[PDB]
Design a protein around this ligand. Structure first.
Ligand SMILES: CCCOc1ccn2c(C(C)=O)cc(-c3ccccc3S(C)(=O)=O)c2c1
Length: 117
Protein backbone atom coordinates (compact mmCIF):
# COMPACT_ATOMS: atom_id res chain seq x y z
CA UNK A 1 0.00 0.00 0.00
CA UNK A 2 0.95 3.70 0.14
CA UNK A 3 4.64 4.07 1.12
CA UNK A 4 4.82 0.33 1.90
CA UNK A 5 6.82 -1.27 -0.88
CA UNK A 6 6.58 -4.95 -1.59
CA UNK A 7 9.77 -6.69 -2.69
CA UNK A 8 9.75 -7.28 -6.48
CA UNK A 9 11.70 -9.57 -8.77
CA UNK A 10 14.45 -8.19 -10.98
CA UNK A 11 12.79 -7.80 -14.43
CA UNK A 12 15.81 -6.24 -16.22
CA UNK A 13 16.57 -9.40 -18.27
CA UNK A 14 12.93 -10.24 -19.15
CA UNK A 15 13.02 -8.70 -22.67
CA UNK A 16 16.16 -10.57 -23.71
CA UNK A 17 14.93 -13.78 -22.17
CA UNK A 18 11.47 -13.62 -23.88
CA UNK A 19 13.20 -12.75 -27.19
CA UNK A 20 15.40 -15.87 -26.80
CA UNK A 21 12.36 -18.03 -26.00
CA UNK A 22 10.56 -16.69 -29.07
CA UNK A 23 13.58 -17.37 -31.28
CA UNK A 24 13.59 -21.00 -30.04
CA UNK A 25 9.89 -21.27 -30.87
CA UNK A 26 10.35 -19.70 -34.34
CA UNK A 27 13.10 -22.27 -35.20
CA UNK A 28 11.28 -25.46 -33.89
CA UNK A 29 10.40 -27.90 -36.69
CA UNK A 30 6.76 -27.87 -35.68
CA UNK A 31 6.46 -23.99 -35.73
CA UNK A 32 5.27 -23.93 -39.37
CA UNK A 33 1.58 -23.35 -38.66
CA UNK A 34 2.42 -20.34 -36.39
CA UNK A 35 5.01 -18.29 -38.25
CA UNK A 36 2.49 -15.93 -39.96
CA UNK A 37 -1.05 -14.85 -39.27
CA UNK A 38 -3.65 -17.38 -40.32
CA UNK A 39 -4.65 -16.36 -43.77
CA UNK A 40 -8.10 -14.81 -43.29
CA UNK A 41 -8.87 -14.75 -47.01
CA UNK A 42 -8.15 -18.41 -47.58
CA UNK A 43 -9.33 -19.98 -44.33
CA UNK A 44 -13.14 -20.14 -43.93
CA UNK A 45 -14.46 -19.80 -40.37
CA UNK A 46 -11.31 -18.23 -38.98
CA UNK A 47 -12.16 -14.56 -38.83
CA UNK A 48 -15.64 -15.07 -37.34
CA UNK A 49 -14.71 -17.85 -34.95
CA UNK A 50 -11.27 -16.65 -33.69
CA UNK A 51 -11.83 -13.28 -32.05
CA UNK A 52 -8.19 -12.55 -31.30
CA UNK A 53 -5.86 -14.06 -33.86
CA UNK A 54 -2.20 -14.30 -32.82
CA UNK A 55 0.98 -15.73 -34.37
CA UNK A 56 4.77 -15.68 -33.76
CA UNK A 57 5.50 -12.86 -36.28
CA UNK A 58 2.95 -10.61 -34.61
CA UNK A 59 4.45 -11.46 -31.23
CA UNK A 60 7.93 -10.66 -32.55
CA UNK A 61 6.75 -7.25 -33.91
CA UNK A 62 5.13 -6.47 -30.57
CA UNK A 63 8.18 -7.49 -28.58
CA UNK A 64 10.50 -5.44 -30.80
CA UNK A 65 8.37 -2.26 -30.52
CA UNK A 66 7.73 -2.10 -26.75
CA UNK A 67 4.16 -3.29 -26.90
CA UNK A 68 4.47 -5.77 -23.99
CA UNK A 69 4.28 -4.02 -20.59
CA UNK A 70 5.67 -7.12 -18.84
CA UNK A 71 6.55 -10.75 -19.21
CA UNK A 72 3.01 -11.98 -18.32
CA UNK A 73 1.50 -10.09 -21.23
CA UNK A 74 4.00 -11.83 -23.52
CA UNK A 75 3.12 -15.32 -22.19
CA UNK A 76 -0.59 -14.50 -22.67
CA UNK A 77 -0.05 -13.84 -26.41
CA UNK A 78 2.05 -17.03 -26.78
CA UNK A 79 -0.71 -19.08 -25.06
CA UNK A 80 -3.31 -17.35 -27.19
CA UNK A 81 -1.62 -18.84 -30.28
CA UNK A 82 -2.09 -22.37 -28.92
CA UNK A 83 -5.59 -21.77 -27.50
CA UNK A 84 -6.68 -20.50 -30.96
CA UNK A 85 -5.06 -23.51 -32.55
CA UNK A 86 -7.07 -25.90 -30.31
CA UNK A 87 -10.30 -23.99 -30.92
CA UNK A 88 -9.99 -24.26 -34.71
CA UNK A 89 -8.13 -27.51 -35.36
CA UNK A 90 -8.87 -31.18 -34.55
CA UNK A 91 -6.31 -32.64 -32.03
CA UNK A 92 -5.63 -35.33 -34.59
CA UNK A 93 -4.65 -32.97 -37.46
CA UNK A 94 -1.00 -32.12 -38.29
CA UNK A 95 -1.65 -28.51 -37.22
CA UNK A 96 -3.43 -29.62 -34.04
CA UNK A 97 -0.56 -31.95 -33.06
CA UNK A 98 1.94 -29.20 -33.86
CA UNK A 99 0.17 -26.88 -31.44
CA UNK A 100 0.14 -29.33 -28.55
CA UNK A 101 3.83 -29.99 -29.09
CA UNK A 102 4.72 -26.27 -29.24
CA UNK A 103 2.74 -25.50 -26.15
CA UNK A 104 4.51 -28.21 -24.13
CA UNK A 105 7.77 -26.87 -25.50
CA UNK A 106 6.96 -23.29 -24.52
CA UNK A 107 5.71 -23.97 -21.01
CA UNK A 108 8.87 -25.89 -20.04
CA UNK A 109 11.13 -23.04 -21.30
CA UNK A 110 8.89 -20.61 -19.44
CA UNK A 111 9.23 -22.54 -16.14
CA UNK A 112 12.92 -23.14 -16.53
CA UNK A 113 13.61 -19.52 -17.39
CA UNK A 114 11.42 -17.60 -14.90
CA UNK A 115 9.45 -19.77 -12.45
CA UNK A 116 11.81 -22.66 -11.54
CA UNK A 117 14.70 -20.16 -11.81
C1 LIG B 1 -6.55 -23.15 -47.22
C2 LIG B 1 -6.79 -24.07 -46.01
C3 LIG B 1 -5.71 -23.81 -44.93
O1 LIG B 1 -6.32 -23.84 -43.62
C4 LIG B 1 -5.56 -23.51 -42.52
C5 LIG B 1 -6.22 -23.48 -41.29
C6 LIG B 1 -5.52 -23.18 -40.14
N1 LIG B 1 -4.14 -22.89 -40.28
C7 LIG B 1 -3.27 -22.59 -39.27
C8 LIG B 1 -3.63 -22.48 -37.93
C9 LIG B 1 -2.55 -22.12 -36.92
O2 LIG B 1 -4.80 -22.64 -37.50
C10 LIG B 1 -2.06 -22.40 -39.86
C11 LIG B 1 -2.20 -22.62 -41.22
C12 LIG B 1 -1.20 -22.62 -42.15
C13 LIG B 1 -0.63 -23.86 -42.48
C14 LIG B 1 0.43 -24.00 -43.38
C15 LIG B 1 0.99 -22.88 -43.99
C16 LIG B 1 0.44 -21.65 -43.68
C17 LIG B 1 -0.62 -21.50 -42.79
S1 LIG B 1 -1.17 -19.85 -42.48
C18 LIG B 1 -0.51 -19.33 -40.91
O3 LIG B 1 -0.53 -19.08 -43.60
O4 LIG B 1 -2.63 -19.79 -42.54
C19 LIG B 1 -3.49 -22.91 -41.46
C20 LIG B 1 -4.17 -23.22 -42.58
Amino acid sequence: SMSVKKPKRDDSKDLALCSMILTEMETHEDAWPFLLPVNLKLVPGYKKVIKKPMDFSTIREKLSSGQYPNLETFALDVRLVFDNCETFNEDDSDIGRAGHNMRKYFEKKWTDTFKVS
